[PDB]
């Protein structure tokens, strides 16, 4: 028994009506449950049979569907309803649907940090690029060393959406050996987001 | 009230085994099934198995068949889950969830979770390096700390002993190719205070019982 959950991620404003659909690969009668999970939190049961609301869940959460459709409708979205939702078919759970707060597009404030002198003495150089308060979360980050793309020696993470301005922040770390970091001069970090690219750079030793 | 309390976090070498308890209260422990879940970092939930507390009968998923052992102790209303021959993709957060009768679909109540980290790395304290500011971004400057090469999760970062909270972004840690975690915490401050206001990041790594305070000075 297989599960396909769609959409992977949607963005909606407060008070909107959202629908999350997850489909089984065969007849499942009414053996489908819905769960809500916030980041760093514990999953919470919303609806268990196919439309039977769990006690304590607000009326805005509704379930429906027969066969393999099995939608999930929130009539009026609320600030506390922005989280990831899962559907369960017997022993199989869906990929999940992320509900995002809709907001205006915002260009990130880009900062670049050269590796600290303290870290250089241990033989490893880490240069960090900061993207501050941008929207949407989809942003491409690239590293250029002496005008040459690195492409395979960096990692990044994204903070959870801010509760005030509903924006995201990203931190990317380019990891190089001390020897390699001192064989080059120009270090640049580029942010590509919606027909706009911003490149913050610095020159080592300057 | 219906409550499920699990044991603390565990760190295991590959090939070892981990046992997690689930102490329940507020309901008849023998009248409901007890399931075991796990969630890899950044992944979804998957079902490992359940145990009927009345007779101890179990039903494991085929993925964990022959590698997971689920027991219970009715006298203390506790359910146990053991996973042997651990590997890197056994790292995750494990839950115990309650289901009614001889069912598995409705999971009404869950435990708080137990973080199990499996790696050949050993518990190590972090190396905190400064993200020193200079400014070239108007009246706002950015500074922070780079918490580097620590194991296992988690670490907590505050600024000025919690006095500085506005504009603070503490990013999720990333797992490096060496098996050590590394994250960064940043804060945006007025550029006019770089040379006078003292900024100190307080990094606490409870697994190694190491607390590092680092002052970030402008260059």
Residue numbers in the entry:
A (entry chain L): 2 to 91, 96 to 211
B (entry chain H): 1 to 52, 52A, 53 to 82, 82A, 82B, 82C, 83 to 100, 100A, ...
The authors write:
These bnAb precursors, that target the CD4 receptor binding site, had undergone somatic hypermutation characteristic of the VRC01-class.
A subset of isolated VRC01-class monoclonal antibodies neutralized wild-type pseudoviruses and was structurally extremely similar to bnAb VRC01.
